[PDB]
């Protein structure tokens, strides 16, 4: 067995999901939201469900917050945490924009990190492996791996926003029990 180290990933969200206004209901924002999940293996040979919850944001266009939870029904647990070229610092979610023509524009995490204005597009994910011994300092044992979204501005195997349903569109990653 052997552990997730990137997974190339990529859905559509649908475009045609409504808008929403800064003080939208929470059942506004359901409606406007899309939940996925996708395996990710750690290095014990045990099999984690990551979920994903994108949401569009209230009062902005384009713009999708992912929140990332690992063993979803044990959630705090794995305090789950998500960054662009950390996972220090920040929580577990992060906003996606798009473009006008709905390609992939930036991400950005909850210490407020940003992708580079081109080029692939790397989320780095780190939860805590429930059960493990600590690492040999004694720091709590966690998963490190990184979510490719594809390259910005382009869309084969990029996530997009067409006006179509929301779906994967890939998953391919590198770990196994």
Same mark, same amino acid.
């Given at each position: 067995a052997k552990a997730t180290t990137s997974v190339n990933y990529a859905c559509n969200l649908d475009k045609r999901l409504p808008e929403l206004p800064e003080g939208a209901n929470r059942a506004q924002i359901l409606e406007s939201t899309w939940s996925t999940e996708f395996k990710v293996y750690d290095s014990f040979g045990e099999a984690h469900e990551l979920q994903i919850d994108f949401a569009r944001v209230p009062g902005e266009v384009n713009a999708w917050r992912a929140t990332v939870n690992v063993d979803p029904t044990n959630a705090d647990a794995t305090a789950t945490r998500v960054g662009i @070229? #950390?996972?220090? @610092?920040?929580?577990n979610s992060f906003i996606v924009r798009f473009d006008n023509n709905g390609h992939l524009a930036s991400v950005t995490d909850t210490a407020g990190n940003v992708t580079s204005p081109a080029g692939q597009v790397l989320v780095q994910i780190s939860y805590n492996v429930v059960g493990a011994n600590p690492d040999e300092a004694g720091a709590p044992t966690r998963h490190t791996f990184d979510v490719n979204l594809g390259?910005? @501005? #382009?869309?084969?195997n990029t996530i997009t926003q067409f006006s179509d349903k929301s779906t994967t569109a890939a998953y391919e990653q590198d770990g196994y029990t």
């Open positions: @070229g #950390t996972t220090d @610092g920040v929580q390259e910005i @501005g #382009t869309s084969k």
